[PDB]
Ligand binder design. Structure first.
Ligand code: MN
Ligand code: MN
Ligand code: MN
Ligand code: MN
Ligand code: MN
Ligand code: MN
Lengths: 314, 314, 314
């Protein structure tokens, strides 16, 4: 059985829109804990991380709210490390994706040999020098990669960071809106990726086959799945800040994670960018959150073909 | 050419919702007969089966309306057997899926070597002892399978039944909402299935290849396709009682059946669970019924690439 | 780098609906030129072709507005030939698909060894004798094929035409609504096609592999892609005259063209049948045109995985 450690991370300062903070809340009000308990899941809730307020957080060059973002990630990282030392799969119900910096870091401190599957429409690998917006939810991967060391300036609030994963230990799935500099980084750092073009070409099945062998071919190491709800199509997860048309299917999102589950190697998981305040209607909020819950439950066992306990049902 | 024998089965007592009874009506008002005639189809309509009224039909344990359901199925079975003896492909335009018990049975009486392709979101293999609802439209397959003999209690109104197909002669396509006991039965009776996870993995093409060789590998036996409109996604067939997200595509539904047609071995066909009364809007009823008609016409020849008679069009 | 030559073709007399004329306008107001310039694209706009008015254009047998259609195509053909002699990829932003007759012809005059990929829900290969409607936007391919010579009557306004491509040099992708006579022609002239049934079966990836080797196997010849917006599903391009359910995906449409781009052999391109006047709502017009623009930009380099200039972004 796989034990979970819910880490509620109500943070939004990684981008403009604020309703992303109430994500852990809407996901819990959906029933995530209870639903996980109906399965063979042992759940321990480490509550919501009460991220402080830093009023004096002016921009660094063009980088926005660095101290708040860097501090929320430093806070998240210790909890993730805590739950992992507790022998539990950390489930970070977050707001924006900047929290990944602290999630992968915290996870790597206890499991330095971790592998990352990054599901998203964007690569989020911009540096403080290549970013055009400044929103740090589009910059996490650059703070985490060892090879991109020496190319990221000293962002106030991130001094604590130490690049933990190398470009060879991460796979992207779902790309379709990647900036010029980010693309340069991908081809230059030789990052394996499966944008929507490769999903179309090879199919969701082949893509997973290749991503799992790519990361577990040499050995069987822990897997960190950082899932951004906008990796899925905006017809399934509309309530998100940066939606891009032509996304992963509801089916593909479930296939992605059922396969991840099946490796039995999941150790870290992030479900981010669900902003109920961005729903056009009340049902759009519902369609977004429900899809978010469904993918979470599949990361922990829920299979479409069916599930049954080890007993004689007849 | 393939001759058809329309058997209108207006029945709903296999579940709570009643608008499923007016299914044969909405499908006929759509033009099914006329549309089939535009093809190389010979159609003979055996009318709608006037299912009696059984007022004294209290529950059996938790099993609901057994005598009505068992009687409608006993009635349907003879007609199906009748049309088959008439050398015609029985087309059961039904209401709920409990009618399958009588459809496969009636068909098997004349063709005991039949194979079944069950398109659905559910396996409908609950027994009177494993069911939680009691609705018999979620129990048909258990009354039909020989191996599940000795595990189904004597349900008033079903004494006439004799398990006709063995767990080895049926394939499910489209699963994604299967109960714990049903799943136990699947793995225990070794039933071949293709839930949405396998469709995602292998593709709709591979799935059909495997289902047709699985059933026709040894010999070329008659094929009974029991099609539940909710096997398709709720974006194509919304007007149905038990819709589950992440279903088969409009395209996949047409691919399924064009391939079935192409075997030239179709002998039995059911198009069930279309409930026009469950439409949120008038167009949802239209989208459901039209999709239902489209899949029917493909079971009898209509191909997307085109169709032409044996003559010189130029 | 690939240079473009925009040929605005505001014509509608190939079918009943007139709002297709304002297609070049809505596509330009969307930003097609500007967007192409953000890429490594050299764009030269040859303006909109001012198609004359022919009031005395009564039907030929059942063929409608032949002189206007034949004259608009004769006009378009010279411009296409002009831009091609200018060493530029002709981009015909049209109205209805009858304009293809002049587009492929004009293109073939300068590049007789051209190959055609025809993306559509229909084959548009009806002759003046096999057509039931008379709308010439459903007849273009028959005027262009050499083998169908002797089977098309002398349509006033088309005398200038000379069949330029043979049945062996064209591939259809996306078919699902083909008439009996057209189908006869396909099987008789041995035209390679990939209707929606083959896309479902083999996948969009395999389909392109086979279409590109089918046309470029012997040599590397110029490619003419005639793209009809209704080849895509009506959920992506609703504002079109003849929409048919179960079309190509947004993703598949982008995959089709990214692959075409990647051959580096695109020379001719048509983006037709966008009729903003057929939108049910203002956003349907937007969804249609935006999808139209997206596919255009992919024909000229825009890749979902990302794009970057030959420089050191770090
Ligand atoms: Mn992200
Ligand atoms: Mn994203
Ligand atoms: Mn059913
Ligand atoms: Mn069902
Ligand atoms: Mn066309
Ligand atoms: Mn068309």
């Amino acid at each position: 059985s796989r034990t979970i450690g819910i880490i509620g991370a109500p943070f939004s300062k990684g981008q403009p829109r604020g309703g992303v903070e109430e994500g852990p809340t809407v996901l819990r009000k959906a029933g995530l804990l209870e639903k996980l308990k109906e399965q063979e899941c042992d759940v321990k809730d480490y509550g919501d991380l009460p991220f402080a307020d830093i009023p004096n957080d002016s921009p660094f060059q063009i980088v926005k709210n660095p101290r708040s973002v860097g501090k929320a990630s430093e806070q998240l990282a210790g909890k993730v490390a805590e739950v992992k030392k507790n022998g539990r799969i950390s489930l970070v119900l977050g707001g924006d994706h900047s929290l990944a910096i602290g999630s992968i870091s915290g996870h790597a401190r206890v499991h330095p040999d971790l592998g990352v599957i990054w599901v998203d429409a964007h690569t989020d690998i911009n540096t403080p020098l290549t970013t055009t917006s400044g929103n740090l939810h589009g910059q996490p991967v650059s703070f985490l990669l060892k090879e991109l060391k020496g190319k990221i300036p000293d962002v106030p609030g991130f001094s604590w960071v130490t690049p933990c994963i190398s470009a060879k230990d991460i796979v992207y799935i779902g790309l379709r809106d990647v900036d010029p500099g980010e693309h340069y980084i991908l081809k230059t750092l030789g990052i394996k990726y499966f944008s929507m073009t490769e999903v179309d070409r090879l199919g969701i099945g082949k893509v997973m086959e290749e991503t799992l062998s790519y990361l577990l071919g040499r050995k069987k190491r822990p897997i960190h799945l950082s899932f951004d709800v906008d990796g899925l199509d905006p017809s399934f997860t509309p309530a998100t800040g940066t939606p891009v048309v032509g996304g992963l299917t509801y089916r593909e999102g479930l296939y992605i994670t059922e396969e991840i589950y099946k490796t039995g190697l999941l150790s870290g998981l992030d479900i981010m960018e669900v902003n109920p305040s961005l729903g056009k209607t009340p049902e759009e909020v519902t369609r977004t959150v429900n899809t978010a819950v469904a993918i979470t439950l599949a990361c922990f066992g829920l299979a479409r073909e069916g599930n049954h306990k080890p007993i004689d049902y007849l």
